[PDB]
């Protein structure tokens, strides 16, 4: 049928991939060794041997530490050994190293593995890429891989799950350089790119889940739940199925504006679960508060351009229609005038599954929301500002130049970002 | 995999290296005989970064012993953890520098550098993917300063792409252990500013203050000081040996902490440091570690960071903790102390987290700050140097080894230019 390939790059990508694959194996009832203890999951798992299922995943990193963590964990015997590809030295938060000097060493091997996996599928429709803007390996090698994939294939979709840099929380000094460079390179090669923000997920875990020690496991579990809600329409049948292509056809009005925002509902703790009889309308309302967004930006500062809703479990289409109508009539949110019909809605039968040891209670209905809004423009501006603050005095620039990246490239990237900002302010003006 | 070759020169280098290797061996669970008696697989998973495995379940540290007099490393060999080292790595001369930079750099170093380089090459080619070189020494001695600069220059010529890190014992501001330390310090920085990727500065006076004030130690010895230095070294190089949620290696630190090629002089710090009686009254929490680290008194260099502004900061947390707390502490520090950070760099702080708890307590954290205030140190040295160069005191001791006053003038001019750069990088201009 329809097949999808998952690509995980860098530390963030690999950890998110581990969480996602644990969640998928739990959802489809697959033991950690690959067996089944008792079938539409051919989209992600391929059959082999005597009832063994191998995920269609490729893990790429320039440092062996995290991949070796995976290779000795509980899921060591799940992944195909050749799908975990490692280098020897990481980019060290250097875009140039991961894009020019180091990435070119293993780009060919990664592409070989990619094409070997792709030839196995009959109805492949797209690739999933997990990575991070801030890192060197993540941003640089992701840009290189997107370039190669777009050249080789061109027509298949390429969705992106990326960790946008947080407005306040930072874990590196060279984040603006890497972010601007990778955005300039990948701006014309990604069909759609959802983002998550670590600061926003920290805030969500603090406010809703009543957790004061949210290790990366909780954040990765949240992200895995979101991606599961995205791909459930492929993995299960429902009253209204949504493919991978429909996302890009419905949320990207122009090729240069493909940066939606991902939320999820309901996010509650076990104790508060008993005191709230959760219904479709209230979940739909909850998906639209700024405090529940997973990117630290206020949607009320901008205007929506397109919205996508994905419902799971006990869901009645009439209630969905009523809730969406109520949302539309509420004037606290705004929509661009040139998009009178700004909603796509899909419904799936299979409810979300609760991972034991997790921190989310059991619900019979869930909603994943993706909104392409102009409020993200502010974020870009902030990033650009930081870049300028660091580029007037040419700080750290020699590090990038010594790896072969010409200085003028920086200028191009910055100029490109300026245009992108203009683009947003051009479409955020009604007429 | 990513492997580190460790070099020690001079008395201070040998002593600090002995303490550091004892600390590392205890951390990885290796007995003094060199046979692994550990209890975890992670101790052996990344043992190759520092150790070479020999036949019969034995591990040989990847270390080189360099000195111009045999007394120090004879003491090292005859003492405990003396049979762990490979005997062929012990390189000694017979004369000694005698606290003379010229003697150790031009006359004795010229004789010893060939053998030392041969041993270093033999160690390096036996590696798989060398990550960089690490050296421990001082600047106020003859052998340490001269041979360290010579070896650093030769290795930088040999491997221009690897990583050079140095732990240098800079001279103390108040009490001097030698009369001719300004000459050696200037002549050593004149080479460090050109051939070293990054350098951490440690002052014995600050360590004395730490042990007497924080640790409540009545009679500190060099053992305690080398213990602290070894703890800092292990905290720095812990992401190469144990897995963590967010890890950083040497190249990552160099990229994130060196804005310009001539500014690579950092100030280290360690937390938590507490006495035996006070450990019952305080709670080990991430905010406590962060508050201790960003403390003027806790610095391992005798410079007050409040005089200048930070350029970059690296925080290597270790143990099990929550990075929400880590990031909230970083944000609180940045907003409260916003007067101590340069405006032309947002996100001054880089963070790394190692899962394995420090051998020791539940949680710990290493701090590495790149502050402009360190220029004061250089400035101070300049004054002393010129105060002793106008009268040409002790100058014949050096010019009798072939050196000339042109070298002294060049060194003082270069390091004064460095002082100007560090000082005037405190201008916002925006």
């Amino acid at each position: 049928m329809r097949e999808c390939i998952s690509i995980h790059v860098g530390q963030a990508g690999v950890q998110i991939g581990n969480a996602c694959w644990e969640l998928y194996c739990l959802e489809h009832g697959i033991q950690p060794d690959g067996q089944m203890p008792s079938d539409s999951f051919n989209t992600f798992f391929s059959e082999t041997g005597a009832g063994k299922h191998v995920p269609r995943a490729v893990f790429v990193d320039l440092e062996p530490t995290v991949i070796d963590e995976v290779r000795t964990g509980t899921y060591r015997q799940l992944f195909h050994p050749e799908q975990l590809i490692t280098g020897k030295e990481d980019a060290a938060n250097n875009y140039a190293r991961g894009h020019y000097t180091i990435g070119k060493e293993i780009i060919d091997l990664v592409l070989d593995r990619i094409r070997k996996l792709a030839d196995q599928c009959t109805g492949l429709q797209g690739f999933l890429v997990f990575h991070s803007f801030g890192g060197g390996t993540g941003s640089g090698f992701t840009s290189l891989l997107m370039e190669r994939l777009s050249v080789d294939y061109g027509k298949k979709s390429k969705l992106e799950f990326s960790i946008y840099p947080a407005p306040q929380v930072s874990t590196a000094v060279v984040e603006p350089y890497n972010s601007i460079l990778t955005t300039h390179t990948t701006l014309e090669h990604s069909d759609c790119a959802f983002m998550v923000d670590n600061e926003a997920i920290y805030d969500i875990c603090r406010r809703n889940l009543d957790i004061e020690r949210p290790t990366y496991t909780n954040l990765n579990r949240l992200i895995s739940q979101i991606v599961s809600s995205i791909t459930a329409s492929l993995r299960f049948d429902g009253a209204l199925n949504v493919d991978l292509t429909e996302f890009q056809t419905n949320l990207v009005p122009y090729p240069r504006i493909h940066f939606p925002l991902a939320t999820y509902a309901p996010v509650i703790s076990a104790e508060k679960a008993y005191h709230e009889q959760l219904s479709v309308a209230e979940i739909t309302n909850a998906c639209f508060e700024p405090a529940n967004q997973m990117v630290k930006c206020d949607p009320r500062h901008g205007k929506y351009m397109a919205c996508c809703l994905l419902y799971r479990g006990d869901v009645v289409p009439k209630d969905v229609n009523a809730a969406i109508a109520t949302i539309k009539t509420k004037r606290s949110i705004q929509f661009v005038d040139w998009c009178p019909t700004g909603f796509k809605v899909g419904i799936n039968y299979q409810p979300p599954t609760v991972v034991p040891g997790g921190d989310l209670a059991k619900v019979q209905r869930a909603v994943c929301m993706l909104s392409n809004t102009t409020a993200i423009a502010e974020a870009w501006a902030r990033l650009d500002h930081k870049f300028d603050l660091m580029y007037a005095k040419r700080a750290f620039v020699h590090w990038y130049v010594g790896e072969g990246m010409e200085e003028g490239e920086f200028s191009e990237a910055r100029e490109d970002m300026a245009a992108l900002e203009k683009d947003y302010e051009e479409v955020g003006v009604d007429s | 995999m990513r492997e580190i070759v460790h070099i020690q020169a001079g008395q201070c280098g040998n002593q600090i290296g002995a303490k550091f290797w004892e600390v590392i061996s205890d951390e990885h669970g290796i007995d003094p005989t060199g046979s692994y008696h550990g209890d975890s697989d992670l101790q052996l998973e990344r043992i190759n970064v520092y150790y070479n495995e020999a036949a019969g379940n034995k591990y040989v540290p990847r270390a080189i012993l360099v000195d111009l007099e045999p007394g120090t490393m004879d003491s090292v060999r005859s003492g405990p953890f003396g049979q762990i080292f490979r005997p062929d790595n012990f390189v000694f001369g017979q004369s000694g520098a005698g606290n003379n930079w010229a003697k150790g750099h031009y006359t004795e170093g010229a004789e010893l550098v060939d053998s030392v380089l041969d041993v270093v090459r033999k160690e390096s080619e036996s590696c798989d993917c060398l990550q960089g070189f690490q050296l421990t020494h001082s600047l106020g001695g003859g052998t340490g300063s001269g041979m360290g600069t010579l070896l650093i220059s030769k290795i930088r010529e040999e491997y221009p792409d690897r990583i050079m890190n140095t732990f240098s014992v800079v001279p103390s501001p108040k009490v001097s252990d030698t009369v001719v330390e300004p000459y050696n310090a200037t002549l050593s920085v004149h080479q460090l500013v050109e051939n070293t990727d990054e350098t951490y500065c440690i002052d014995n006076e600050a360590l004395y203050d730490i042990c007497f004030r924080t640790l409540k130690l009545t009679t500190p010895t060099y053992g305690d000081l080398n213990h602290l230095v070894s703890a800092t070294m292990s905290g720095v190089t812990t992401c190469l040996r144990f897995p963590g949620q967010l890890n950083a290696d040497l190249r990552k630190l160099a990229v994130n902490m060196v804005p310009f090629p001539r500014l690579h002089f950092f100030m280290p710090g360690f937390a938590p440091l507490t006495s035996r009686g006070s450990q019952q009254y305080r709670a080990l929490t991430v905010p406590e570690l962060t508050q201790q680290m960003f403390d003027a008194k806790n610095m391992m260099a005798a410079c007050d960071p409040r005089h200048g502004r930070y350029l970059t900061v690296a925080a290597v947390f270790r143990g099990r903790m929550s990075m929400k707390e880590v990031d909230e502490q970083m944000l609180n520090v940045q907003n409260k102390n916003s007067s101590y950070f340069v405006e032309w760099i947002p996100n001054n702080v880089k963070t790394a987290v190692c899962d394995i708890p420090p051998r020791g307590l539940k949680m710990s954290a290493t701090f590495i700050g790149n502050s402009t205030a360190i220029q004061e140190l250089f400035k101070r040295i300049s004054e002393q140097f010129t105060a002793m160069f106008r009268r040409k005191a002790f100058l014949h001791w050096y010019t009798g080894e072939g050196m000339d006053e042109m070298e002294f003038t060049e060194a003082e001019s270069n390091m004064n230019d460095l002082v100007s750069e560090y000082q005037q990088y405190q201008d916002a201009t925006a």
Binding site: Y254, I257, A392, A419, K422, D423, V427 | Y425
Partner: peptide, 27 residues
């Protein structure tokens, strides 16, 4: 005796790349 390389960086004018205004004059 050393001055830093301070560059007068500025984005004077940048034009939008989206073709949203092409058919704004359509009947």
């Amino acid at each position: 005796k050393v001055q830093i390389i301070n560059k007068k960086l500025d984005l004077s004018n940048v034009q939008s790349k989206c073709g949203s205004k092409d058919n704004i004059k359509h009947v």
